[PDB]
Amino acid sequence: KELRCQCIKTYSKPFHPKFIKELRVIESGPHCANTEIIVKLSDGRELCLDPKENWVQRVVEKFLKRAEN
Amino acid sequence: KELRCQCIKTYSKPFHPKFIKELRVIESGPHCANTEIIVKLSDGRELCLDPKENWVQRVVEKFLKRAEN
């Protein structure tokens, strides 16, 4: 339940939110100096995304609007 | 990695986003007919939230804005 940082790199190419099926956002703290965004893709693969990127914020917002329907 | 629905009930009292340290959003699919929002609180407890509630959408948005700083 208590892991260190989970992301070794972040994916830098924008993509459409339809390809996300799960989102995890882990705020920075004693376990990891960076906030981490981990997404599970439609096919089960996992990717980390940079929370400071405008396109990442937009993709997350769009995923949330959809999952909430 | 493949669980059924993870939420037995959702917490119905609004609260301040400062008390969230992790957010998971799991879109509905074959594993669970409902989209689920699971938050880890500052002290490690877990709560599920109803994604259709306006206050929940607002708390999530605020958490994201903060974690992204």
Side-chain angles (χ1 to χ4, degrees), chain A residues 22-25 27 66, chain B residues 22-25 27 66:
Chain A
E22 181 174 336
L23 166 71
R24 204 169 159 204
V25 183
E27 189 170 28
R66 185 181 86 233
Chain B
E22 181 174 336
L23 166 71
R24 204 169 159 204
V25 183
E27 189 170 28
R66 185 181 86 233

